[PDB]
Amino acid sequence: LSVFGDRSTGETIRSQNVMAAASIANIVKSSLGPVGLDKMLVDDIGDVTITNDGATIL
Amino acid sequence: NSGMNPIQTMTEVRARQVKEMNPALGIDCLHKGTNDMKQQHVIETLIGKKQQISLATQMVRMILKIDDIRK
Amino acid sequence: KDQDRKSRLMGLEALKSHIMAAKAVANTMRTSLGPNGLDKMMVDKDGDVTVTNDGATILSMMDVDHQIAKLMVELSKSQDDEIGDGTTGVVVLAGALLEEAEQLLDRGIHPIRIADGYEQAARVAIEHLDKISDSVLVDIKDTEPLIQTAKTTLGSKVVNSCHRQMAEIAVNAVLTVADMERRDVDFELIKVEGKVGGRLEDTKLIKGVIVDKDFSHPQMPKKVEDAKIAILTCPFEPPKPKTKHKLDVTSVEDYKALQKYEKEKFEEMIQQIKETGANLAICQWGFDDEANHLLLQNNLPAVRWVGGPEIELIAIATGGRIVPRFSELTAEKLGFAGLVQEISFGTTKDKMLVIEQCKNSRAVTIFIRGGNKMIIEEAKRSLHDALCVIRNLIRDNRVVYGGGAAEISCALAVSQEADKCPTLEQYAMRAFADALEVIPMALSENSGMNPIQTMTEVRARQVKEMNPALGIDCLHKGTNDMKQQHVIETLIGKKQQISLATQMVRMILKIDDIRKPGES
Amino acid sequence: NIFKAGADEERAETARLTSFIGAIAIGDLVKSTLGPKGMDKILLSSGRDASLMVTNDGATILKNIGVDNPAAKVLVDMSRVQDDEVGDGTTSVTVLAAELLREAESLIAKKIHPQTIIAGWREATKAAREALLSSAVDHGSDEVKFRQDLMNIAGTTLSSKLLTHHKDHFTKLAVEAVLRLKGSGNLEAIHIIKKLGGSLADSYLDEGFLLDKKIGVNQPKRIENAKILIANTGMDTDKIKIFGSRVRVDSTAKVAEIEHAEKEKMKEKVERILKHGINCFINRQLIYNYPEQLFGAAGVMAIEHADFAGVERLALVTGGEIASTFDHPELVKLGSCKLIEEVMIGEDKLIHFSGVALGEACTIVLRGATQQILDEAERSLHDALCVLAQTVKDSRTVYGGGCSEMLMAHAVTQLANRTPGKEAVAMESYAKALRMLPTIIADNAGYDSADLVAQLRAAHSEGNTTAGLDMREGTIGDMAILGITESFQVKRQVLLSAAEAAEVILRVDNIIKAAPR
Amino acid sequence: PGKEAVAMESYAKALRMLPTIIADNAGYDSADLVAQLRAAHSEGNTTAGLDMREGTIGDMAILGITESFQVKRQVLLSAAEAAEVILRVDNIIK
Amino acid sequence: ELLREAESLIAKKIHPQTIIAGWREATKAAREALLSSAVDHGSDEVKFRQDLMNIAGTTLSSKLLTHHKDHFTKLAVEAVLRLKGSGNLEAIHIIKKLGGSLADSYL
Amino acid sequence: YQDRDKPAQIRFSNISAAKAVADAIRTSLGPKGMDKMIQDGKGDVTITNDGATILKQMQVLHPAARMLVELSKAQDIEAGDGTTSVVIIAGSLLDSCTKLLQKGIHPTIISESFQKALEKGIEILTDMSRPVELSDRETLLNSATTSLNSKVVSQYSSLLSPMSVNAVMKVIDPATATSVDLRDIKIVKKLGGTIDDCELVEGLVLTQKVSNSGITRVEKAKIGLIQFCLSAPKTDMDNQIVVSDYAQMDRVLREERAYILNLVKQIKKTGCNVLLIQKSILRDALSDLALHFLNKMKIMVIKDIEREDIEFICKTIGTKPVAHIDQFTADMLGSAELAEEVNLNGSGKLLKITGCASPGKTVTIVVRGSNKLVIEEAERSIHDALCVIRCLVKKRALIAGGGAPEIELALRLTEYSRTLSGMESYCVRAFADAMEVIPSTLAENAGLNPISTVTELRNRHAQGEKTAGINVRKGGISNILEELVVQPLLVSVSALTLATETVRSILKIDDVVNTR
């Protein structure tokens, strides 16, 4: 087959979609609650912002 | 094995057993005149045919029940 | 300068490398020998396809890079005017002479002994050809056996189906431009043109000059019996330059004045043909519509759009001169012709001009026809090969039987005279006898027979049976003795085939070092 | 340092293998399309996607593919020179010359010279041409039986194409145009009209030389004593085929000075036409409305936009001439027509003539959905009208479909009984190649090729020169009873051209390639 | 019939190779002697054969070259039977 | 060559069982042409004796005995014609002795 | 066998390349089917489960696999629905010939046998269908809400359904004519309002503006279409405008005025009152001076017309396009009673033209809506409702949905295989097993067992009728006729004819070659 990309189907795209989605939950796992922990937001310039609010994290 | 088409000979005898006549016809494997091997005196037994389809089926059930060989 | 990147070949291995450069040319053309020769595919540089088996087209198109193979190209510039029939014959003879000389080089003999030994045995083979040659036209002239010998050299190609009427044409063309007692036949006085369409039986012999141009008007008369033809470069009209006139008009006062100024020029130069006495007006450029209306009333035809070399080709045959303008018009430079006619070919709009003298002229042109353009260029070379055989018959009416009959009898005389040579050139004389047998051996190999079985049967025939030589059955005829089959070669064509083959081996064997500087 | 820098040399063992592999690969390229049940091919250009098209015509495949090998290049244009003068048998001249060289390599492996096979094939060609002379039958009378034989050769030509589904309707129109002609085989008397709309079975026919062009704005619908005069001049506006000329425009009055020069120059042109004393005018270029009003008041029909098929065909169906210039009158022959009727077929203005001198002209009006169907149907009727006109000059016909080929294979085999030895094996090579022509036809239809073709050897040996292959049932039947026959001149042309081009390949033992610039 | 015709052509080609190898082992042109004998035996003339001594095609009646019939019947029957066995073989069990 | 030509038949999609049926019918026809070409000798035994040297000359071909093949054909025909018995070759005795050429063989 | 030459490996390469197209699109079938995610080259990710978009976004380069792309494109013009289901039918068909090509069957024998299965397959779908009437307005109304309820828009399925039935009745005479053209029903959408504020205009509605012509209201309008750019005198060749003084600068402005007014005076002689100008980007189609010359002659200015909008005009009023001003005649004019600009609160600035009085029947559906996502899916619900009415005109019959004719086709062709002879017996057996993929796909996409559902449904069709099938709403086998899931016949009967000619064309392709 000659197409304009790469094709992949089956249950392997189901397992890759839940591992990419649950990894985002680990970014907002420890920051939940009033005692949530801060997390470093590294920018492309080089500076970092220390935010613990989960709305500003996502 | 008779040197003919395997599908064209098969699909014309099964059409002969339905359309023009209800009794079954055979396949002229010896390159005889025509079909209907009752006139050609090709006769097999009933117990030799009832056990042909039986022991072939029972050997499939012994194979399909085996799913692991460990040596 | 440039010593680095320079190919060198010296020592004994350079001698065998020059042999291998010549063995590659001979082995390709040993299959295209005789009338049963195999065809050769030629791939052009731009993509055209043309298939032939002629020897002169092989050597001219073979883009070889070796200088030893380039020396094999040099012989074709002088052989086609001399023999015309053995172009494939001298290449296999120069190659098979080096084949046995490759065996002689293993013994350690110097090539200056082989090149002198080949020249020693060539004079024996030349002297043996004069003893076995038979005359045709001694003490008298005749045209009947000259057509029969011309039918054999012409029918070796695909044009054998109409070989009868084309053989009578080349005999009358040579006898018109040249006399048999003068023995000076000019190839430049015989021209060959052709156009597509028709058959090979429609070949006409035009004693004069032909150009592929029509008249200036379709109402012009197609018959000029008077021998007064004016050949000029500027047409009888108001004067126009060579590329673009570009007349500038301003208003109706300039258009009315330039019309009357052109009407005087339309009346003067048209009537300037009658004061001298000319009838046909061959001009380089065409005529206008106002000039073509006046040429019809005064009965003066004219030829339009005559090219560059088409002007000078007419004035040589008719005896005219290139006149630059109307002021230099004299009756002495006017052309002479017996019949000027226009001949069309079916629905084709070529309408070439046929200038005939109706007498014994000195420049005759041949117009061949055919169903394909690749056959017309093949039949032009086919008649050109027939012109050289008749040229060889005039200089010497003695002929020798070809088709392998002259080659085997020459090999018997050289091998008999080789035993009377008590020096190191004896092996070169026996080498010349073995290489002379290769040309009749390659004739039987191309015919589909056994080459060694066909050769040695004639050896028992030319010795035990009869002392006159017998030929090799190449066209699958009834039997041998091709003298009865009327396949006879020329004596000058057979003598110069031996001499040119010895000349090329002498120049190859004497060369022992090549230096080719590359790029830097 | 013999052949370098682009130069390549094919030796005696190399050029013999290159000429055989290159000719077979072209021969095996279009052998699948042979027969009525042939396969199709995918043709597409490299680097482009819009050139994707599927056609199983043998000439359409070979005209599009580029050829690199020179030994196979002389085989491709051999199928092209069969296509223009005949139009049928393009697939047969390729695969028969390829099968002749496919059996020739077995002889060269058996130590046979190629020039020996040439002398054997020339004797086998004359015996195969004599078998068609004995089996040819003519029809001087019984034109209702001659109408059957024209319909059999029409369906054979229309097979393996897009029109093989509705071929029962097209064979009633292509044959009827031939019977109404009844004379010379000139195809300029038959016109092909391509109009959109309708299916293939909705094709109409007109016996009055129907034209596929509309004329004027307000043309007269009926004219008696139509006097035809054709010309080729520009009548629309100025600068006719002149590029680079410019007129200075300074105001709106300078625009009208161009029109005032246009109204004066066109008025001098119509006065050159009406001095001839004519009644109908045909031109290749468009005619403006202002000379159209001069032609309408004078009662002269102005026919506009004539193509090369317009001037060349109307010069002989009306008895006129081309007549490109009309500067001086009374020097041209004029046409003749009785009545000109304007018929609307396909929602277009169509020009119908009636009662013309040499009134054997006809017109098959084809109908299709788009232009790709009509351009294919225009080629579908063009190759059929060539071979139908061939049978008018020579009404000899032979039984096709493997009947004439197996009779040719039997005639060469009888010549192998009275021959020398070295020419016998070469004639047997001609005998096996003629048997392969119904073999690939039977193999393309999926039948048993060893059962159908090899049974024709035993059938045609002891009489019975009528049985052939019937692809409808897949059983050997009589071709004279079923009505399957072909022409004699086309079947003789595919025998001579496939044998002459096969003589070129065996004659060549060395290919010389020059340096490409 | 059809499929039996191609098999009979293979049997005629195998019997034509027996004078071909004899003509090839004797050094003569095997493509000329045997191919002329096929045309000689086609339309009458069922007497001429191969001559190894003179190297041409001669009459076997005046030359005195003949073979026994029971040996020629034995070789033709055994070679067709030996080719009958191996042609039916499609599998080797070792 | 029987298996060499039948090898290309399996390449042409032909079953090997149909080739044997084509060879069994060709075997009866090849024996029929051998029966028409068979020339017997019911009488004229002096011409039949001349044919017996042709059988001895054909069997002794391509051997070492080509130096004196004419002498061995005369001794071969005298052993069977004086026997007039069955095909058992125990009645003839073959002697292996040195000395002498092939032409001096005795019966 | 030897099998030196291999032309069937290209057939196996053509089958396996087309099999990957149908297998990748197989799980997107049905309403409960799985959606597909695409990624563009720039990085855009768009979630869309419609089968006509994924085949446009796949961008195949194989010639054999491209034949399924225009197969879906021909289904959108012929039927307007049923799109992916033709590909899975044609994809499962080439899977069945993979078992047939290994057996030694030539593909041209399968081509004549699949046409015989197509001729028999049409006959099974004819008598099992339910014939209905086109003049009955209750049948076309009730069958359109049932098909639109499974779409994205279902809360407005009771409103857009009578708007689609009443649009085709002014265009097509019910139960007399057979040809239905969807190009004569233009759907105009603009921002503002809801979908409930809709108008059925019997004439035509344009989305452009009459600026800057200050007329905006004309009676007895003779509409004419001009493709020539009415502008300043422009020459594409080399030209020059000579200048002499300040009075010469006002003369070339008067020359631009007098040249356009000479063209405007040619329009007034034929009685034309409304001018239509085609959209042109390469040059100015209308200058500033030509806008004022038509205002003095009370001629309405209309420009910026797409090429597809020109087709809607000539079938409405009978106006023919002209290429230049010298060819402007009186015969190329239309007919109109009134032309004006109506600017509503939600309909926008549109040109409402009523009073056609011309040979031709076109309608216009003006749909309003607040958001941009509202009106685009309203047009997709209309085009899905316009196709089920067009499918009912050419075939006056109805069938059940959920793959219920596909199981009946697999059972009757099996009984037809016992009465045939020759090669055609096994090809119709493979034709019957290739039709069982469509219920097996709907069994897998609904969460049921794919084998146990289609096996129970075959025994329900041997004893009963086509009422048994797969109900995706309740998730199980039920009565499709009682579930009111009814599809037209032209969706399925054209899905068989188009897939059979593609499989016959793919199997007939032997070799692939490249030209230059």
Ligand SMILES: Nc1ncnc2c1ncn2[C@@H]1O[C@H](COP(=O)(O)OP(=O)(O)OP(=O)(O)O)[C@@H](O)[C@H]1O
């Ligand atoms: N009918 C014939 N039978 C036997 N030998 C012949 C016959 N005709 C010509 N020959 C021989 O063939 C030789 C010519 O060979 P070939 O045709 O290859 O050269 P050619 O093509 O004529 O040369 P060129 O290229 O100059 O025309 C002659 O020397 C002649 O002896």
Ligand SMILES: Nc1ncnc2c1ncn2[C@@H]1O[C@H](COP(=O)(O)OP(=O)(O)OP(=O)(O)O)[C@@H](O)[C@H]1O
């Ligand atoms: N109905 C038929 N029955 C038997 N043989 C047929 C039938 N139709 C065609 N043929 C055979 O097919 C051959 C023609 O092959 P094919 O149709 O592939 O090429 P063609 O279309 O004639 O070539 P062209 O495209 O130049 O017309 C003929 O020789 C004819 O014998």
Ligand SMILES: Nc1ncnc2c1ncn2[C@@H]1O[C@H](COP(=O)(O)OP(=O)(O)OP(=O)(O)O)[C@@H](O)[C@H]1O
């Ligand atoms: N409301 C429904 N209830 C049950 N099944 C349905 C319903 N609507 C459609 N189907 C089934 O789903 C299949 C179509 O699924 P899908 O919606 O993916 O494609 P489509 O675009 O509607 O049609 P096509 O695939 O022909 O273009 C049809 O075969 C039909 O049998």
